[PDB]
Amino acid sequence: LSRNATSSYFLGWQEYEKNPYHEVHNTNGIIQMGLAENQLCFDLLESWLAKNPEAAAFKKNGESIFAELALFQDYHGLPAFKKAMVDFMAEIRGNKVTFDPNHLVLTAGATSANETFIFCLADPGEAVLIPTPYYPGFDRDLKWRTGVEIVPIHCTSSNGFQITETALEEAYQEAEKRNLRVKGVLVTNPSNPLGTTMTRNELYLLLSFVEDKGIHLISDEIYSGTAFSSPSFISVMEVLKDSEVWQRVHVVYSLSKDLGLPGFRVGAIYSNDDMVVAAATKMSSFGLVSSQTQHLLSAMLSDKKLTKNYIAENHKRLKQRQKKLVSGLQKSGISCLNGNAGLFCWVDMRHLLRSNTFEAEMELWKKIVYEVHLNISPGSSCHCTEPGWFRVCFANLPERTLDLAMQRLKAFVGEYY
Amino acid sequence: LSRNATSSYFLGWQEYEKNPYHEVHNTNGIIQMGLAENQLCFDLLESWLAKNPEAAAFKKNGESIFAELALFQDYHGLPAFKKAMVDFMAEIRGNKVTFDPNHLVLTAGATSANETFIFCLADPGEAVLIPTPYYPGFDRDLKWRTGVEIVPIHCTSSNGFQITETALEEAYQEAEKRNLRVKGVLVTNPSNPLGTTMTRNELYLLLSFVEDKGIHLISDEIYSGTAFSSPSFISVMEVLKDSEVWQRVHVVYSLSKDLGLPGFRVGAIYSNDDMVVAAATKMSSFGLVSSQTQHLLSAMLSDKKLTKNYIAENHKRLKQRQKKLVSGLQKSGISCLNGNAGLFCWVDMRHLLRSNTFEAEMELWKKIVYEVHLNISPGSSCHCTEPGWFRVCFANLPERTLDLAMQRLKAFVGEYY
Ligand SMILES: *CC[C@H](NCc1c(COP(=O)(O)O)cnc(C)c1O)C(=O)O
Ligand SMILES: *CC[C@H](NCc1c(COP(=O)(O)O)cnc(C)c1O)C(=O)O
Ligand SMILES: [K+]
Ligand code: NI
Ligand code: NI
Ligand code: NI
Ligand code: NI
């Protein structure tokens, strides 16, 4: 084959499938708390669909448009869907910001949109700065086929894993050291795996740093609609609304996490740079969104009654579900980073480490997966600077199963501590 | 931006949108005969859908499976859909060959599957051999992000644009000359833009050549279901059915052309090499097929009554439509390559060239688009070795519009010749 053709986050995931938990067929199975999915609000969608069958019937205004959709492969995207998307994104941001649909580019999921953005701004050998801890999938998405390098901006629990001027300069000094040409910074807001919204000061800090370095800022806002608690979610685009730096600020979105439709593969890129758009637009040809899905979500995201109620009901259920995990953890004497967003909790299990090393982290992880039968993501998998932290997903399973996981966890700790 | 971020086939296409033809709003518009789309058999699908609403209703065996689909993002693909796909591909090949679903990899269209295959077999700087003329989109799909080079295997009208032992060695000698490492040959069977099925002798010739060079063979069989006339379509996989070369034979498929659903973005890769599959599989994450589309086509492609009737009715309508273009052309004294497949005719307009040059070809093309108001693909756009040839699509428009195009063409020739 070729070079391109030739961790724990992916292993635990594969182990889960080798022996998945089932409330009837396999009660001693592995419980999956390692995938950030949101299955809480399906009933609201399932209900709406069964009563609004026209979208799925390839019909518009009553008349069939099956032929038009079957042929639609325009890499510019279905216009009705792009408008519905930019309004939904505006609604999530309290309508404090507005997006132009001619500047929105659809992609098959955010996995496809992040890689695409890398291909547009960084040539092989070049580099991007990314705050750690970060989504484990980034190592694959952003590097495998682009040949670009990620230089970590380290963050510690000292200041709640926030981004500091110190970390930024330090990460950039590491780039210059390795003679790597830094093309930009890619941040996740709200943060995965932290489950925290970025503060306005962090945002201004990023905007200033990339203004002094003449580089790009990419904000992965896929969890923007999962901000179920104060403070408020602040889009990087809102911070620009209060010279030439805005042409270097970009947004990556997806309907995978707030709507819980990762299977439909709807992602997007939004940039103010007319050039980035045109190039990203052309690249979407490699991963367009099914026109069938575009038309369906175009009808759903157009029902302002459905979206207003969905957002409010999702925040509510997320918050309730989050407290149930926190309390379940507090029950075993385990604390979490104070999070107000995401579909997971960044958990502090340092006090359970044999030693302050990653080797010890690994060991604790193995036991949890092979003994407690729970799949969670270790912090080294997220490139966290300090051992002991784990990401635990709480919205990808039934409440009762969540309780079960907690019990198996309480037993374990009260079984070795 | 970056290097990656920074012809006539694409221009004529853009001109068409700047002034598209319309049988009511714009009769002097440009007629599109440059896009190989099949709108002939939509009625059969549209009809089936309106009477089998469950697929589009996210329901299986009566029960809702909306939640399961919404969450399905497995890069291994929905199993029911993969089985339905491998049987449909088997049916198109007269069930003379069988495909294993664990060896089939889904991608968002064949555009996504061809690039992916390039990333798996060729490292940047390396090369692939491709018979000309070939699909203009290949220059973008296979080279833009892979950095791989295409070395043309020239074919002339002398022997009906078939592939000869001479052309193969010659193309390979050109590679060695440019110190390019040849990784394989990528062929289109049936051929685009020729609209001809590959003969068994050509297939054996390719299998032998790649066996002597120790390289891979990729067969783009996206038009396999558009073989509406004798001789029969012969899959490269059938030729292998009558030592270690089969592990280097691969197939690229799509539902864009036989089913006429380019908008749904369903593509696939099939290889016998367990290693290629696993790697292609991982790469599909960048362009997965919407689970909604997978489930819909899983029901449709499972109705053996629908598929048997669709295939037979499609061949029939294609053949009838093809003769209508040939006769329309013969009417202006224009001949075509004797084609038995595809959604287009490879037309000989050499006798209309001011001179035997491409400059003259360009000139004839400009006039046709700007004067006759017809969009067709010139042969240089396909990297044809001899000027004067044009690809004309006949299945992407209403019969009456097709007649109109013919009239405007007859007038033109009888207006300058
Ligand atoms: C649901 C997986 C979750 N996060 C994934 C993810 C993506 C991929 O999303 P998609 O749109 O479905 O391709 C892109 N960006 C980020 C920042 C994340 O987290 C997880 O398990 O972490
Ligand atoms: C319908 C366009 C037609 N051929 C396209 C094409 C593709 C892309 O197909 P998709 O599956 O929709 O991404 C891939 N391979 C080949 C060989 C062709 O021709 C055209 O206008 O030529
Ligand atoms: K897709
Ligand atoms: Ni367009
Ligand atoms: Ni603009
Ligand atoms: Ni899988
Ligand atoms: Ni096998």
PDB file of C-alpha atoms in Angstrom, chain B residues 135-382:
ATOM      1  CA  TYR B 135     -13.455  11.654 -17.156  1.00  0.00           C
ATOM      2  CA  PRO B 136     -12.302  15.315 -16.776  1.00  0.00           C
ATOM      3  CA  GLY B 137     -13.114  15.198 -13.071  1.00  0.00           C
ATOM      4  CA  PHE B 138     -10.203  12.823 -12.543  1.00  0.00           C
ATOM      5  CA  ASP B 139      -7.707  15.674 -12.631  1.00  0.00           C
ATOM      6  CA  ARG B 140      -9.336  17.107  -9.521  1.00  0.00           C
ATOM      7  CA  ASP B 141     -10.499  13.974  -7.715  1.00  0.00           C
ATOM      8  CA  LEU B 142      -7.295  12.002  -7.928  1.00  0.00           C
ATOM      9  CA  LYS B 143      -4.647  14.728  -7.742  1.00  0.00           C
ATOM     10  CA  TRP B 144      -5.710  17.844  -5.816  1.00  0.00           C
ATOM     11  CA  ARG B 145      -5.272  16.467  -2.302  1.00  0.00           C
ATOM     12  CA  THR B 146      -3.291  13.273  -2.859  1.00  0.00           C
ATOM     13  CA  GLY B 147      -0.380  14.858  -4.676  1.00  0.00           C
ATOM     14  CA  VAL B 148      -0.300  11.770  -6.902  1.00  0.00           C
ATOM     15  CA  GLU B 149       0.348  11.972 -10.665  1.00  0.00           C
ATOM     16  CA  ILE B 150      -1.631  10.534 -13.567  1.00  0.00           C
ATOM     17  CA  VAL B 151       0.310   9.152 -16.508  1.00  0.00           C
ATOM     18  CA  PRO B 152      -1.904   8.845 -19.604  1.00  0.00           C
ATOM     19  CA  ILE B 153      -2.213   5.621 -21.592  1.00  0.00           C
ATOM     20  CA  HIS B 154      -3.016   7.072 -25.018  1.00  0.00           C
ATOM     21  CA  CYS B 155      -5.767   5.590 -27.191  1.00  0.00           C
ATOM     22  CA  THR B 156      -6.739   6.575 -30.730  1.00  0.00           C
ATOM     23  CA  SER B 157      -9.739   6.147 -33.018  1.00  0.00           C
ATOM     24  CA  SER B 158      -7.601   3.834 -35.170  1.00  0.00           C
ATOM     25  CA  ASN B 159      -8.641   0.762 -33.162  1.00  0.00           C
ATOM     26  CA  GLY B 160     -11.764   2.341 -31.679  1.00  0.00           C
ATOM     27  CA  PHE B 161      -9.966   3.879 -28.707  1.00  0.00           C
ATOM     28  CA  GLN B 162      -9.251   0.453 -27.241  1.00  0.00           C
ATOM     29  CA  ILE B 163      -6.285  -0.252 -24.955  1.00  0.00           C
ATOM     30  CA  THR B 164      -3.282  -1.839 -26.657  1.00  0.00           C
ATOM     31  CA  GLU B 165      -0.186  -3.603 -25.303  1.00  0.00           C
ATOM     32  CA  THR B 166       1.727  -0.848 -27.088  1.00  0.00           C
ATOM     33  CA  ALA B 167       0.023   2.004 -25.239  1.00  0.00           C
ATOM     34  CA  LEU B 168       0.545   0.291 -21.881  1.00  0.00           C
ATOM     35  CA  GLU B 169       4.289  -0.262 -22.224  1.00  0.00           C
ATOM     36  CA  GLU B 170       4.653   3.206 -23.690  1.00  0.00           C
ATOM     37  CA  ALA B 171       2.812   4.857 -20.784  1.00  0.00           C
ATOM     38  CA  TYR B 172       4.879   2.838 -18.326  1.00  0.00           C
ATOM     39  CA  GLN B 173       8.102   3.782 -20.126  1.00  0.00           C
ATOM     40  CA  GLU B 174       7.069   7.401 -19.715  1.00  0.00           C
ATOM     41  CA  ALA B 175       6.713   6.845 -15.957  1.00  0.00           C
ATOM     42  CA  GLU B 176      10.153   5.215 -15.611  1.00  0.00           C
ATOM     43  CA  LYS B 177      11.439   8.131 -17.687  1.00  0.00           C
ATOM     44  CA  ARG B 178      10.065  10.631 -15.185  1.00  0.00           C
ATOM     45  CA  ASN B 179      11.303   8.463 -12.326  1.00  0.00           C
ATOM     46  CA  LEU B 180       7.682   8.140 -11.184  1.00  0.00           C
ATOM     47  CA  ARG B 181       6.832   5.059  -9.129  1.00  0.00           C
ATOM     48  CA  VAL B 182       3.764   3.507 -10.797  1.00  0.00           C
ATOM     49  CA  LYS B 183       1.380   2.107  -8.227  1.00  0.00           C
ATOM     50  CA  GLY B 184      -1.377   0.920 -10.516  1.00  0.00           C
ATOM     51  CA  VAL B 185      -3.758   1.437 -13.419  1.00  0.00           C
ATOM     52  CA  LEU B 186      -7.211   2.945 -13.022  1.00  0.00           C
ATOM     53  CA  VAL B 187      -9.688   2.118 -15.789  1.00  0.00           C
ATOM     54  CA  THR B 188     -13.305   2.987 -16.479  1.00  0.00           C
ATOM     55  CA  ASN B 189     -15.483   0.038 -17.515  1.00  0.00           C
ATOM     56  CA  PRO B 190     -17.861   0.849 -19.178  1.00  0.00           C
ATOM     57  CA  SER B 191     -15.806   3.784 -20.431  1.00  0.00           C
ATOM     58  CA  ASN B 192     -16.595   7.435 -19.867  1.00  0.00           C
ATOM     59  CA  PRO B 193     -16.505   9.300 -22.331  1.00  0.00           C
ATOM     60  CA  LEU B 194     -16.425   6.476 -24.912  1.00  0.00           C
ATOM     61  CA  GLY B 195     -19.661   4.822 -23.821  1.00  0.00           C
ATOM     62  CA  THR B 196     -18.276   1.399 -24.632  1.00  0.00           C
ATOM     63  CA  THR B 197     -17.905  -1.775 -22.595  1.00  0.00           C
ATOM     64  CA  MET B 198     -14.384  -3.172 -22.291  1.00  0.00           C
ATOM     65  CA  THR B 199     -13.728  -6.301 -24.347  1.00  0.00           C
ATOM     66  CA  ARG B 200     -12.548  -9.467 -22.652  1.00  0.00           C
ATOM     67  CA  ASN B 201      -9.219  -9.216 -24.517  1.00  0.00           C
ATOM     68  CA  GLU B 202      -8.649  -5.699 -23.094  1.00  0.00           C
ATOM     69  CA  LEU B 203      -9.436  -7.004 -19.618  1.00  0.00           C
ATOM     70  CA  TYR B 204      -7.019  -9.957 -19.904  1.00  0.00           C
ATOM     71  CA  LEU B 205      -4.425  -7.538 -21.275  1.00  0.00           C
ATOM     72  CA  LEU B 206      -4.779  -5.316 -18.193  1.00  0.00           C
ATOM     73  CA  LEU B 207      -4.711  -8.228 -15.790  1.00  0.00           C
ATOM     74  CA  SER B 208      -1.534  -9.504 -17.451  1.00  0.00           C
ATOM     75  CA  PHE B 209       0.230  -6.151 -17.530  1.00  0.00           C
ATOM     76  CA  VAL B 210      -0.369  -5.455 -13.825  1.00  0.00           C
ATOM     77  CA  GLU B 211       0.699  -9.008 -13.067  1.00  0.00           C
ATOM     78  CA  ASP B 212       4.038  -8.399 -14.809  1.00  0.00           C
ATOM     79  CA  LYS B 213       4.512  -5.025 -13.157  1.00  0.00           C
ATOM     80  CA  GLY B 214       3.424  -6.050  -9.681  1.00  0.00           C
ATOM     81  CA  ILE B 215       0.970  -3.119  -9.490  1.00  0.00           C
ATOM     82  CA  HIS B 216      -2.727  -2.592  -8.715  1.00  0.00           C
ATOM     83  CA  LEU B 217      -5.732  -2.531 -10.999  1.00  0.00           C
ATOM     84  CA  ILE B 218      -8.645  -0.254 -10.207  1.00  0.00           C
ATOM     85  CA  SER B 219     -11.803  -0.568 -12.267  1.00  0.00           C
ATOM     86  CA  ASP B 220     -14.305   2.279 -12.048  1.00  0.00           C
ATOM     87  CA  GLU B 221     -17.523   0.384 -12.861  1.00  0.00           C
ATOM     88  CA  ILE B 222     -19.981   3.210 -12.070  1.00  0.00           C
ATOM     89  CA  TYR B 223     -21.649   2.740 -15.474  1.00  0.00           C
ATOM     90  CA  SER B 224     -21.962  -1.044 -15.214  1.00  0.00           C
ATOM     91  CA  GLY B 225     -25.752  -0.824 -15.122  1.00  0.00           C
ATOM     92  CA  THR B 226     -25.988   1.399 -18.212  1.00  0.00           C
ATOM     93  CA  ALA B 227     -24.902  -1.319 -20.649  1.00  0.00           C
ATOM     94  CA  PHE B 228     -28.025  -1.139 -22.854  1.00  0.00           C
ATOM     95  CA  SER B 229     -26.651  -2.984 -25.903  1.00  0.00           C
ATOM     96  CA  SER B 230     -24.458  -5.860 -27.011  1.00  0.00           C
ATOM     97  CA  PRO B 231     -21.851  -6.876 -26.297  1.00  0.00           C
ATOM     98  CA  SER B 232     -22.308  -7.663 -22.624  1.00  0.00           C
ATOM     99  CA  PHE B 233     -20.715  -5.795 -19.750  1.00  0.00           C
ATOM    100  CA  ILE B 234     -17.804  -7.806 -18.403  1.00  0.00           C
ATOM    101  CA  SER B 235     -16.648  -6.974 -14.890  1.00  0.00           C
ATOM    102  CA  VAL B 236     -12.960  -7.265 -14.164  1.00  0.00           C
ATOM    103  CA  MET B 237     -14.042  -9.506 -11.292  1.00  0.00           C
ATOM    104  CA  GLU B 238     -15.582 -11.966 -13.743  1.00  0.00           C
ATOM    105  CA  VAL B 239     -12.327 -12.200 -15.682  1.00  0.00           C
ATOM    106  CA  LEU B 240     -10.603 -13.300 -12.469  1.00  0.00           C
ATOM    107  CA  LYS B 241     -13.203 -16.070 -12.221  1.00  0.00           C
ATOM    108  CA  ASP B 242     -11.942 -17.739 -15.399  1.00  0.00           C
ATOM    109  CA  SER B 243      -2.506 -16.629  -7.816  1.00  0.00           C
ATOM    110  CA  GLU B 244      -1.906 -13.349  -5.996  1.00  0.00           C
ATOM    111  CA  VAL B 245      -3.002 -10.828  -8.613  1.00  0.00           C
ATOM    112  CA  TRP B 246      -6.597 -10.876  -7.398  1.00  0.00           C
ATOM    113  CA  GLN B 247      -5.516  -9.215  -4.163  1.00  0.00           C
ATOM    114  CA  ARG B 248      -4.530  -6.267  -6.346  1.00  0.00           C
ATOM    115  CA  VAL B 249      -7.741  -5.960  -8.341  1.00  0.00           C
ATOM    116  CA  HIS B 250     -10.263  -3.413  -7.053  1.00  0.00           C
ATOM    117  CA  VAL B 251     -13.655  -2.047  -7.945  1.00  0.00           C
ATOM    118  CA  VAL B 252     -15.232   1.334  -7.536  1.00  0.00           C
ATOM    119  CA  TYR B 253     -18.999   1.612  -7.734  1.00  0.00           C
ATOM    120  CA  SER B 254     -21.773   4.158  -7.206  1.00  0.00           C
ATOM    121  CA  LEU B 255     -25.582   4.459  -7.426  1.00  0.00           C
ATOM    122  CA  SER B 256     -25.241   7.865  -9.019  1.00  0.00           C
ATOM    123  CA  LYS B 257     -25.499   6.717 -12.641  1.00  0.00           C
ATOM    124  CA  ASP B 258     -27.579   3.543 -12.985  1.00  0.00           C
ATOM    125  CA  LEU B 259     -30.127   4.600 -10.404  1.00  0.00           C
ATOM    126  CA  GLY B 260     -29.821   8.267 -11.229  1.00  0.00           C
ATOM    127  CA  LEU B 261     -29.369   9.298  -7.569  1.00  0.00           C
ATOM    128  CA  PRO B 262     -26.173  11.412  -7.626  1.00  0.00           C
ATOM    129  CA  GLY B 263     -27.735  13.680  -5.005  1.00  0.00           C
ATOM    130  CA  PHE B 264     -27.842  10.877  -2.415  1.00  0.00           C
ATOM    131  CA  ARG B 265     -24.035  10.396  -2.610  1.00  0.00           C
ATOM    132  CA  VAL B 266     -23.776   6.628  -2.414  1.00  0.00           C
ATOM    133  CA  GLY B 267     -20.416   5.265  -3.493  1.00  0.00           C
ATOM    134  CA  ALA B 268     -18.367   2.209  -2.654  1.00  0.00           C
ATOM    135  CA  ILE B 269     -15.075   0.437  -2.888  1.00  0.00           C
ATOM    136  CA  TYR B 270     -14.672  -3.272  -3.188  1.00  0.00           C
ATOM    137  CA  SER B 271     -11.337  -5.005  -2.812  1.00  0.00           C
ATOM    138  CA  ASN B 272     -10.183  -8.548  -2.124  1.00  0.00           C
ATOM    139  CA  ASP B 273      -7.207  -7.227  -0.130  1.00  0.00           C
ATOM    140  CA  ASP B 274      -8.151  -7.381   3.582  1.00  0.00           C
ATOM    141  CA  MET B 275      -5.605  -4.607   4.197  1.00  0.00           C
ATOM    142  CA  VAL B 276      -6.998  -2.158   1.629  1.00  0.00           C
ATOM    143  CA  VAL B 277     -10.509  -2.618   3.062  1.00  0.00           C
ATOM    144  CA  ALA B 278      -9.514  -1.924   6.658  1.00  0.00           C
ATOM    145  CA  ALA B 279      -7.667   1.229   5.590  1.00  0.00           C
ATOM    146  CA  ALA B 280     -10.374   2.410   3.165  1.00  0.00           C
ATOM    147  CA  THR B 281     -12.870   1.636   5.900  1.00  0.00           C
ATOM    148  CA  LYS B 282     -11.141   3.972   8.320  1.00  0.00           C
ATOM    149  CA  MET B 283     -10.938   6.692   5.683  1.00  0.00           C
ATOM    150  CA  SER B 284     -14.664   6.522   4.960  1.00  0.00           C
ATOM    151  CA  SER B 285     -15.111   8.440   8.261  1.00  0.00           C
ATOM    152  CA  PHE B 286     -14.318  11.509   6.169  1.00  0.00           C
ATOM    153  CA  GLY B 287     -17.272  10.903   3.858  1.00  0.00           C
ATOM    154  CA  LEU B 288     -19.820   8.457   5.219  1.00  0.00           C
ATOM    155  CA  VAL B 289     -23.227   7.865   3.668  1.00  0.00           C
ATOM    156  CA  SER B 290     -26.218   9.267   5.566  1.00  0.00           C
ATOM    157  CA  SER B 291     -27.781   6.396   7.493  1.00  0.00           C
ATOM    158  CA  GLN B 292     -31.146   7.740   6.349  1.00  0.00           C
ATOM    159  CA  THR B 293     -30.206   7.215   2.718  1.00  0.00           C
ATOM    160  CA  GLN B 294     -28.659   3.840   3.574  1.00  0.00           C
ATOM    161  CA  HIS B 295     -31.854   2.614   5.133  1.00  0.00           C
ATOM    162  CA  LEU B 296     -34.058   3.903   2.295  1.00  0.00           C
ATOM    163  CA  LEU B 297     -31.950   2.322  -0.431  1.00  0.00           C
ATOM    164  CA  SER B 298     -31.734  -0.773   1.708  1.00  0.00           C
ATOM    165  CA  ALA B 299     -35.495  -1.275   1.362  1.00  0.00           C
ATOM    166  CA  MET B 300     -35.599  -0.295  -2.322  1.00  0.00           C
ATOM    167  CA  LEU B 301     -32.640  -2.450  -3.343  1.00  0.00           C
ATOM    168  CA  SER B 302     -34.160  -5.317  -1.422  1.00  0.00           C
ATOM    169  CA  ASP B 303     -37.319  -5.433  -3.538  1.00  0.00           C
ATOM    170  CA  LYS B 304     -36.100  -7.904  -6.169  1.00  0.00           C
ATOM    171  CA  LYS B 305     -39.228  -7.066  -8.184  1.00  0.00           C
ATOM    172  CA  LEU B 306     -38.399  -3.370  -8.265  1.00  0.00           C
ATOM    173  CA  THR B 307     -34.734  -3.882  -9.196  1.00  0.00           C
ATOM    174  CA  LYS B 308     -35.391  -6.520 -11.880  1.00  0.00           C
ATOM    175  CA  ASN B 309     -37.957  -4.250 -13.520  1.00  0.00           C
ATOM    176  CA  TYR B 310     -35.837  -1.134 -13.071  1.00  0.00           C
ATOM    177  CA  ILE B 311     -32.775  -2.608 -14.740  1.00  0.00           C
ATOM    178  CA  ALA B 312     -34.747  -3.966 -17.700  1.00  0.00           C
ATOM    179  CA  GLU B 313     -36.728  -0.754 -18.150  1.00  0.00           C
ATOM    180  CA  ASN B 314     -33.597   1.415 -17.811  1.00  0.00           C
ATOM    181  CA  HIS B 315     -31.678  -0.487 -20.549  1.00  0.00           C
ATOM    182  CA  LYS B 316     -34.697  -0.180 -22.844  1.00  0.00           C
ATOM    183  CA  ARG B 317     -35.197   3.544 -22.357  1.00  0.00           C
ATOM    184  CA  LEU B 318     -31.438   4.185 -22.557  1.00  0.00           C
ATOM    185  CA  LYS B 319     -31.177   2.330 -25.875  1.00  0.00           C
ATOM    186  CA  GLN B 320     -34.168   4.133 -27.301  1.00  0.00           C
ATOM    187  CA  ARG B 321     -32.766   7.470 -26.146  1.00  0.00           C
ATOM    188  CA  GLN B 322     -29.309   6.657 -27.532  1.00  0.00           C
ATOM    189  CA  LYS B 323     -30.618   5.905 -31.067  1.00  0.00           C
ATOM    190  CA  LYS B 324     -32.541   9.189 -31.038  1.00  0.00           C
ATOM    191  CA  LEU B 325     -29.306  11.079 -30.473  1.00  0.00           C
ATOM    192  CA  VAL B 326     -27.341   9.052 -33.067  1.00  0.00           C
ATOM    193  CA  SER B 327     -30.027   9.594 -35.693  1.00  0.00           C
ATOM    194  CA  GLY B 328     -30.330  13.255 -34.747  1.00  0.00           C
ATOM    195  CA  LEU B 329     -26.582  13.559 -35.259  1.00  0.00           C
ATOM    196  CA  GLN B 330     -26.555  11.545 -38.510  1.00  0.00           C
ATOM    197  CA  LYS B 331     -29.106  14.163 -39.580  1.00  0.00           C
ATOM    198  CA  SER B 332     -26.394  16.844 -39.507  1.00  0.00           C
ATOM    199  CA  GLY B 333     -23.970  14.328 -40.982  1.00  0.00           C
ATOM    200  CA  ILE B 334     -22.218  13.654 -37.694  1.00  0.00           C
ATOM    201  CA  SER B 335     -21.046  10.178 -36.700  1.00  0.00           C
ATOM    202  CA  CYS B 336     -20.421   8.653 -33.265  1.00  0.00           C
ATOM    203  CA  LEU B 337     -18.194   5.923 -31.860  1.00  0.00           C
ATOM    204  CA  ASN B 338     -20.288   2.731 -31.867  1.00  0.00           C
ATOM    205  CA  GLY B 339     -21.304   2.761 -28.206  1.00  0.00           C
ATOM    206  CA  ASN B 340     -23.398   0.253 -26.251  1.00  0.00           C
ATOM    207  CA  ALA B 341     -23.238   1.891 -22.810  1.00  0.00           C
ATOM    208  CA  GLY B 342     -23.051   4.988 -20.676  1.00  0.00           C
ATOM    209  CA  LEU B 343     -25.303   8.025 -20.709  1.00  0.00           C
ATOM    210  CA  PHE B 344     -23.530   9.723 -23.581  1.00  0.00           C
ATOM    211  CA  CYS B 345     -22.123   9.412 -27.074  1.00  0.00           C
ATOM    212  CA  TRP B 346     -18.480  10.054 -28.024  1.00  0.00           C
ATOM    213  CA  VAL B 347     -19.007  12.156 -31.153  1.00  0.00           C
ATOM    214  CA  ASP B 348     -16.710  12.591 -34.146  1.00  0.00           C
ATOM    215  CA  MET B 349     -16.679  16.206 -35.253  1.00  0.00           C
ATOM    216  CA  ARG B 350     -13.209  16.182 -36.796  1.00  0.00           C
ATOM    217  CA  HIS B 351     -14.674  17.028 -40.195  1.00  0.00           C
ATOM    218  CA  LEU B 352     -15.884  20.314 -38.732  1.00  0.00           C
ATOM    219  CA  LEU B 353     -12.471  21.436 -37.500  1.00  0.00           C
ATOM    220  CA  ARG B 354     -10.871  24.413 -39.241  1.00  0.00           C
ATOM    221  CA  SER B 355      -7.589  22.511 -38.789  1.00  0.00           C
ATOM    222  CA  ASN B 356      -6.326  19.304 -37.158  1.00  0.00           C
ATOM    223  CA  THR B 357      -5.373  21.154 -33.977  1.00  0.00           C
ATOM    224  CA  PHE B 358      -6.778  21.587 -30.484  1.00  0.00           C
ATOM    225  CA  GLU B 359      -6.832  25.328 -31.090  1.00  0.00           C
ATOM    226  CA  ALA B 360      -9.391  24.528 -33.790  1.00  0.00           C
ATOM    227  CA  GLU B 361     -11.228  22.210 -31.379  1.00  0.00           C
ATOM    228  CA  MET B 362     -11.444  25.045 -28.852  1.00  0.00           C
ATOM    229  CA  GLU B 363     -12.816  27.366 -31.519  1.00  0.00           C
ATOM    230  CA  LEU B 364     -15.483  24.870 -32.558  1.00  0.00           C
ATOM    231  CA  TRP B 365     -16.381  24.390 -28.895  1.00  0.00           C
ATOM    232  CA  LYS B 366     -16.734  28.114 -28.172  1.00  0.00           C
ATOM    233  CA  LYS B 367     -19.091  28.561 -31.119  1.00  0.00           C
ATOM    234  CA  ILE B 368     -21.241  25.600 -30.088  1.00  0.00           C
ATOM    235  CA  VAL B 369     -21.621  26.935 -26.544  1.00  0.00           C
ATOM    236  CA  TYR B 370     -21.896  30.652 -27.343  1.00  0.00           C
ATOM    237  CA  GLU B 371     -23.719  30.360 -30.669  1.00  0.00           C
ATOM    238  CA  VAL B 372     -25.633  27.078 -30.769  1.00  0.00           C
ATOM    239  CA  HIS B 373     -26.129  27.430 -27.005  1.00  0.00           C
ATOM    240  CA  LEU B 374     -25.231  23.794 -26.353  1.00  0.00           C
ATOM    241  CA  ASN B 375     -22.990  22.546 -23.593  1.00  0.00           C
ATOM    242  CA  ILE B 376     -20.924  19.509 -24.546  1.00  0.00           C
ATOM    243  CA  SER B 377     -17.507  18.311 -23.411  1.00  0.00           C
ATOM    244  CA  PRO B 378     -14.573  18.807 -25.826  1.00  0.00           C
ATOM    245  CA  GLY B 379     -12.089  15.957 -26.163  1.00  0.00           C
ATOM    246  CA  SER B 380      -9.092  17.927 -24.902  1.00  0.00           C
ATOM    247  CA  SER B 381     -11.011  18.281 -21.661  1.00  0.00           C
ATOM    248  CA  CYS B 382     -10.848  14.451 -21.551  1.00  0.00           C
TER     249      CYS B 382
END
